Design a protein around this ligand. Structure first.
Ligand SMILES: [Cu+2]
Length: 107
């Protein structure tokens, strides 16, 4: 969890929208079982992809406003930004194999 950027509604424009290169933003909440299931998987990808992209999470309990500006309907939802614009999204829980499948396709 040391390799994962903590986002807030206020920090978002700077950390994501203005970042150069690729960011994988994880929308999640403590009440979200399937969001917690993929947290470890996300830590390994921060690891293995450390030279390719940044991983970020935004808690929707404590930050209610950013997700609607993206039409996100419930969590987990992963958004891949490239230079502050969404390139692709993946809704629902997934496995390690499915997550790197998703990444290896847009990097
Ligand atoms: Cu860590």
């Amino acid at each position: 969890s040391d390799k994962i950027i903590h986002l807030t509604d206020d920090s978002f424009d700077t950390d994501v929208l203005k970042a150069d290169g690729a960011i994988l933003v994880d929308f999640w909440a403590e009440w979200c079982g399937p969001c917690k299931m993929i947290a470890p998987i996300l830590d390994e990808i921060a690891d293995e992809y450390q030279g390719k992209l940044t991983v970020a999470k935004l808690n929707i309990d404590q930050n209610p406003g950013t997700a609607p500006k993206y039409g996100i309907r419930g969590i987990p939802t992963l958004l891949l930004f490239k230079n502050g614009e969404v390139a692709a999204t993946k809704v629902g829980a997934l496995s390690k194999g499915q997550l790197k499948c998703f990444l290896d396709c847009n990097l």
